[PDB]
Subunit: 295 residues, 2 copies
């Protein structure tokens, strides 16, 4: 985020050998352009899009450059939270919680509830094996999503943390709403991978719970999402889908076919230098063979 | 592109059950917010980013929604051009050329030159086997990139069409400049895949020309780019890198190891439901075995 917009436009314009005349003519006047390039005028967004076109830089690339080549989002909540969750850093989450608390936006309630629940869960796990969570925070999350008819990706992310907090009927109802947004977003490069990840997680959890009809339904979505418009960017999740199709085959009595497919996915992750993923799925596979009691 | 910004913000705000008070307070005044939501006020970009944060929608997602869930860019030149190139549609390119001509932005010169050259090449191919291109258009493209010190992704795309137009010394010099932008952009989800694609293309062309030192250099970049920050989104290009490492091994006398690796990449594309890619690389592989005269 730590980087005016017009000062960057100037630098880019200059790097391309473009004149002010050719960048700004018909968009804004000469002196307005001079002011904008010194950071003395706030540009409107509609005028800004036209200027970006004149220097051939899409909005998102501009912001990537503008945040000094680091993030593709202003608001780093989900990036930060995922990183902290991932390495279980309860001290870091508490700091993230303190920060967003000082802004105290009213609607940061759901994000705060997520963080609180994650801090209570991690700290209980540090004292026991097993999970220790307040009803108040689960209620906040439930009630935020309750009665919404259409989701943006924020709710997709919320749902994916909150899902175990809801009764089955409610989980299914939210899933059906999620699906309407999936249908729009499956052609969005960023949204597509978030849906793949969520569908992978659900498929995994459904298998473990032996809800095989549902696991098949969700797997079909993971397959579709990962194959959407022949996308290159979702190859990884096609491997994931192959792994879970393998597991489901084992459960449907197609054991040797299922097992060979699952082993092939693991080998594929190895061959493509995703070793840590391969290792993790090997554990999943072994535990599955045991729980399901397979040979 | 066919969709005001404030009218969409209103709809999103409402879908989330958020009040005007909580979205706009401290950003803009009550009545300004009312006007903005009716499309009566042009928002500044800095104020707009703050509002987006209040409804938890990143800028790029907003624009995805705003263009009625279709593109992630305003300017569809490169999307359109790639699609037309891909299915060799010379009538469609000429229409794209006519359109951008009517705007006649001065700097659309390079894009127009690209299109012109592509139309002359395709039409010659329609009359002969082989390629028939004006020096004037190659000069325009050369001279646009000449003396630029830093590239945005626009020049990366230009370079990747123009590359065969330049002498080797100039190709190498431009490549070295490209690399400085690669180093920034390899952490950009969108830029990373564009670099992978370009590095794959160069590696392929260098192999065919038997410039094996250089092919190794470029392959190492394709490997690095495709493995950057452990990214999920570039798995496809790790397969591509495995294919080319195979080919280079064959050329370095490590024939059976190279061949098995190349065959494994093709099988992997098949297993991951990229059949058309697998088929295409099978042709590459066969021709390579022949040219190189391998058994």
């Amino acid at each position: 985020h730590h980087h005016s917009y017009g000062e960057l436009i100037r630098e880019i314009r200059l790097s391309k050998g473009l004149t002010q005349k050719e960048v700004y003519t018909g968009i804004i006047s000469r002196s307005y352009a001079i002011g904008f390039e010194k950071g003395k005028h706030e540009i409107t967004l509609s005028l800004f899009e036209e200027i970006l076109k004149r220097i051939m830089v899409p909005l998102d690339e501009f912001f990537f450059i503008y945040r000094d080549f680091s993030s593709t989002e202003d608001d780093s909540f989900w990036i930060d939270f995922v990183e902290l969750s991932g390495k279980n850093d309860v001290v870091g989450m508490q700091a993230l919680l303190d920060k967003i608390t000082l802004e105290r936006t009213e609607q940061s309630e759901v994000r705060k509830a997520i963080l609180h629940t994650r801090i209570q869960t991690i700290n209980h796990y540090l004292r026991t094996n097993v999970s220790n969570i307040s009803d108040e925070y689960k209620k906040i999350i439930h009630d935020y999503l309750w009665k919404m008819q259409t989701w943006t990706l924020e709710e997709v992310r919320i749902f994916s943390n909150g899902i175990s907090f809801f009764e089955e009927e409610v989980q299914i109802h939210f899933y059906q709403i999620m699906l309407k947004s999936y249908e729009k977003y499956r052609y969005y490069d960023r949204g597509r991978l978030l849906f793949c990840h969520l569908f992978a997680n659900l498929t995994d959890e459904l298998i473990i719970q032996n809800k095989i009809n549902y696991a098949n339904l969700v797997l079909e979505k993971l397959k579709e999402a990962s194959e959407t418009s022949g996308s290159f960017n979702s190859a990884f999740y096609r491997i994931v889908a192959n792994y879970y199709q393998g597991a489901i085959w084992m459960k449907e009595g197609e054991v040797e076919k299922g097992y060979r497919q699952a082993k092939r996915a693991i080998q594929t992750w190895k061959e493509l230098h995703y070793e840590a993923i391969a290792d993790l799925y090997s554990v999943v596979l072994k535990q599955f063979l045991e729980k399901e009691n397979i040979q």
